[PDB]
Each structure stands twice: as C-alpha cells, then as structure tokens.
Design a protein around this motif. Sequence first.
Motif, mmCIF file in Angstrom:
data_model
loop_
_atom_site.group_PDB
_atom_site.id
_atom_site.type_symbol
_atom_site.label_atom_id
_atom_site.label_comp_id
_atom_site.label_asym_id
_atom_site.label_seq_id
_atom_site.Cartn_x
_atom_site.Cartn_y
_atom_site.Cartn_z
ATOM 1 N N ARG A 40 -8.945 10.775 5.021
ATOM 2 C CA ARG A 40 -8.158 10.592 3.782
ATOM 3 C C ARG A 40 -7.065 9.565 4.087
ATOM 4 O O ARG A 40 -6.350 9.689 5.064
ATOM 5 C CB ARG A 40 -7.514 11.917 3.293
ATOM 6 C CG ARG A 40 -8.498 12.862 2.491
ATOM 7 C CD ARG A 40 -7.849 14.213 2.204
ATOM 8 N NE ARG A 40 -7.533 15.083 3.375
ATOM 9 C CZ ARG A 40 -6.681 16.130 3.332
ATOM 10 N NH1 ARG A 40 -5.952 16.314 2.250
ATOM 11 N NH2 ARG A 40 -6.463 16.955 4.384
ATOM 12 N N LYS A 43 -2.104 7.944 1.087
ATOM 13 C CA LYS A 43 -1.780 8.259 -0.342
ATOM 14 C C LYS A 43 -2.374 9.563 -0.854
ATOM 15 O O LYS A 43 -1.874 10.186 -1.808
ATOM 16 C CB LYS A 43 -2.294 7.136 -1.265
ATOM 17 C CG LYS A 43 -1.364 5.997 -1.380
ATOM 18 C CD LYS A 43 -1.687 5.067 -2.549
ATOM 19 C CE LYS A 43 -0.556 4.024 -2.641
ATOM 20 N NZ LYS A 43 -0.815 2.929 -3.646
ATOM 21 N N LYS A 44 -3.462 9.954 -0.207
ATOM 22 C CA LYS A 44 -4.231 11.101 -0.565
ATOM 23 C C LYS A 44 -3.850 12.351 0.207
ATOM 24 O O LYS A 44 -4.547 13.331 0.053
ATOM 25 C CB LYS A 44 -5.758 10.857 -0.345
ATOM 26 C CG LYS A 44 -6.414 9.861 -1.320
ATOM 27 C CD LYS A 44 -7.770 10.334 -1.841
ATOM 28 C CE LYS A 44 -8.582 9.159 -2.326
ATOM 29 N NZ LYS A 44 -8.384 8.054 -1.312
ATOM 30 N N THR A 45 -2.772 12.336 1.010
ATOM 31 C CA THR A 45 -2.386 13.536 1.749
ATOM 32 C C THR A 45 -0.966 14.044 1.439
ATOM 33 O O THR A 45 -0.190 14.294 2.349
ATOM 34 C CB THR A 45 -2.623 13.363 3.278
ATOM 35 O OG1 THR A 45 -1.753 12.343 3.820
ATOM 36 C CG2 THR A 45 -4.072 12.929 3.567
#
Length: 97
Positions: A40, A43-45
Amino acid sequence: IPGLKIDQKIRGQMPERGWTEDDIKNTVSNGATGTSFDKRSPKKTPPDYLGRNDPATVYGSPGKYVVVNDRTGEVTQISDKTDPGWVDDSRIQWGNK
C-alpha cells in the motif's frame, strides 16, 4: 503471534462478509494456507501514512480467507464468505511450492 489488528474498514465489512471475531481468530490459528503481500502506498495507510510493502500470510480456504501482514499483524483483506461467487485475489500463492 500473529498480531492481530483489524482496522475499522475491515470491522465494518465483517458482518457484511460473514465474519465474526471468532471466525477470524479460528481461521488464523488453524494455520497458514498461502502467501501474499501488503503493498500500500503511503496515502493509503491512514493514520500513519507510512506505506506498507510487507509479506503477508493467507489463512482459511478459497472464498473464505483472511490475509494478514506478517510485520504488523494487520488484517488487510477478508473474502466475502457469504458470496458463493467471491473471486479470490489471483495474487495469493496457495499451498506450497
């Protein structure tokens, strides 16, 4: 070991997808059935925004599995047990070899 952390997105999906906490615990404690990754971008965590590029382990069976980040213990995916037509993530390497 292993982990286990479940983020709020997954908790929300659980009863929609046929999972209780116990099902999760039992599936995981029955042992590894395959291998995947937790990949990931930062930005996705949320909330840490560090990104993941970690090995992950699969537990349970086709259509009925959970995927767990090996470094963090985070559950990253759960299949929909409740959908006889759930398409398994093709990226999982099942079994050994």
